[PDB]
Amino acid sequence: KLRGVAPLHLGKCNIAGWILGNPECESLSTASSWSYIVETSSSDNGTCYPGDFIDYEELREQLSSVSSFERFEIFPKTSSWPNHDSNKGVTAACPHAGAKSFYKNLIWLVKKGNSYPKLSKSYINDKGKEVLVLWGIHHPSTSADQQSLYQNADAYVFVGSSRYSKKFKPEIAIRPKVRDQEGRMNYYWTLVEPGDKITFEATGNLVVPRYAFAMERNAGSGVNSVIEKMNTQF
Amino acid sequence: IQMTQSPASLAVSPGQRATITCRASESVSNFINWFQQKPGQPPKLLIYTASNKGTGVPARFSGSGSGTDFTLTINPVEAEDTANYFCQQTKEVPYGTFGGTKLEIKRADAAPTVSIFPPSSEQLTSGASVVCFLNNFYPKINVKWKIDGSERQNGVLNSWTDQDSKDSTYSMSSTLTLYERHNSYTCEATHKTSTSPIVKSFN
Amino acid sequence: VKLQESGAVVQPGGSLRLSCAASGFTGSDYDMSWIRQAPGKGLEWVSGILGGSERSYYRDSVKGRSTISRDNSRKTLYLEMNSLRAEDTAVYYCARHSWGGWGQGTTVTVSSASTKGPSVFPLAPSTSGGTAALGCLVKDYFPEPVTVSWNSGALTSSVHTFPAVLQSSGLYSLSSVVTVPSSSLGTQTYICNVNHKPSNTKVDKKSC
């Protein structure tokens, strides 16, 4: 009957949608820890900008045994992005009541004034914690859409640290319009151990992190005197 | 820019609880907060992360709230609290504060304890000014100046105030004058009182 | 754990640089900040930079204008202000911030108004009080700060009326009181330090 009693049941988003910064979000426990998650699946809604969440089931586990949890501002939207325009990054996928907003934890980045200089950025864990950063990568529909946004024809997106490394390229093509979006937000995550710096190196197509997260874990995840020691608990 | 702002500005007595609030424009909580500012010196930290007393802060001070709504509380009020109090550091965003809230305490003194001083040896070269200190009185007062009198109000921008740690106290007020006229100069403090007078020039 | 700043008046359009000098170690890892309490209330965070990687943040109302920087070696940091302006007049605090301390602050005035030494007339003190209350009047100076000292032990019961701009386009005046025992005056000598930070201009007036 009961395998149950599990902490943090989502009311609104789903793991993906919520931990992403979808605007449908904002419920339930400003911060915490828990045994494992629960989801009203928003599937037909999900993550407002369409695309693929890679290593989703690797992570869904990775967010189970969590003890420490803190969302920190990894780099401000503000002072992090001097050479490219920061708020053009809104789209009609994710409106905040009235106007069309974007995801919370992410900056969707675009050329300021006909320019996209090479984007260089890093981050360094002073924690004894394991910091988890999420970003995304956008492949416009059309070469005009590419150029309207990022200005850089051949645009590569590298990454940083050690545990994880990779390199991405955008695909400019027309998918079926979902929320009038013929493009794609692909989403991703990594885990920065207390010691390593995750680097981001971009000529474009990169949707930057702003808030990040911090956590921890364990294996097994989702006559009178003698009496004076009681029994046990916790 | 993510506004977080405190209520009113309001008074109290040494005896009992002071009560302050801060409304985030949205949810928030790595930092240096404030909690305090004396009327003219550097801001200190009473409560940090909204529940947590900055170690070494007199216990009377206490933090509270939920995301978007927050409260700071000093239970017995002492002469020092006073100050000005600014809920600070939206902790992650452009990092904001607000004005703060007032907080003076209760005394009731009617006794400004007036002191005249006339112009001086040194003020000759330039020009003459007379100065009245009305001190350690509660709460805030009219300094009625007299050389002679009316046919208009009296002019010459003057007066000053502070508030306080220890009571409310001093005002200090000076009559901007050129030479001129009659030898009789009286600052007279009008307050809740029978109006205690001080007068002029003989010596 | 302490902090150290340096600053003054400046012509509007002119540029100015502020400093902070740290002890309490940790000038490399730990980031640090400037933030200003403006007049009219007290107010606002103007800046900061981190530990290694030496990143630079500020808000939009400055951005291109003000620059922050660190030197781990000389343990100091310097806030660069440029194209100073009305609202830029405000009293600046270097600061540290902890994860897991507030400096003296220093006064920038954005003005072309000439720094002018104050002059000080002793207000000499009527029937017998049994307490003698002594003023020292400070008039016609610019800009602030100013610090009136009766010099230590006496500054108990010493009060500095907040100064107001002399109605003339600006210029200032301040007074202060020391309220004293009547067997002290005329007898025990009594004199005030009026000290204007910017101009040099240290001074002493023995009340008479």
From TrEMBL, chain A:
Alphabetical keyword list: Clathrin- and caveolin-independent endocytosis of virus by host, Clathrin-mediated endocytosis of virus by host, Disulfide bond, Fusion of virus membrane with host endosomal membrane, Fusion of virus membrane with host membrane, Glycoprotein, Hemagglutinin, Host cell membrane, Host membrane, Host-virus interaction, Lipoprotein, Membrane, Palmitate, Signal, Transmembrane, Transmembrane helix, Viral attachment to host cell, Viral envelope protein, Viral penetration into host cytoplasm, Virion, Virus endocytosis by host, Virus entry into host cell
One term under GO cellular component: viral envelope
BP-aspect Gene Ontology terms: clathrin-dependent endocytosis of virus by host cell; fusion of virus membrane with host endosome membrane; fusion of virus membrane with host plasma membrane; viral budding from plasma membrane; virion attachment to host cell
Cysteine-cysteine disulfides: 13-25, 48-94
Sample GO molecular function, one term: host cell surface receptor binding
Location within or outside the cell: Host apical cell membrane; Virion membrane
Modified how: Palmitoylated.
Function according to Swiss-Prot or TrEMBL: Binds to sialic acid-containing receptors on the cell surface, bringing about the attachment of the virus particle to the cell. This attachment induces virion internalization either through clathrin-dependent endocytosis or through clathrin- and caveolin-independent pathway. Plays a major role in the determination of host range restriction and virulence. Class I viral fusion protein. Responsible for penetration of the virus into the cell cytoplasm by mediating the fusion of the membrane of the endocytosed virus particle with the endosomal membrane.
Family of this protein: Belongs to the influenza viruses hemagglutinin family.
Record note on quaternary structure: Homotrimer of disulfide-linked HA1-HA2. Interacts with human CACNA1C.
Name this protein carries in UniProt: Hemagglutinin
Species in which this protein is naturally found: Influenza A virus
First-to-last residue of the parent protein present: 60 to 407 of 566
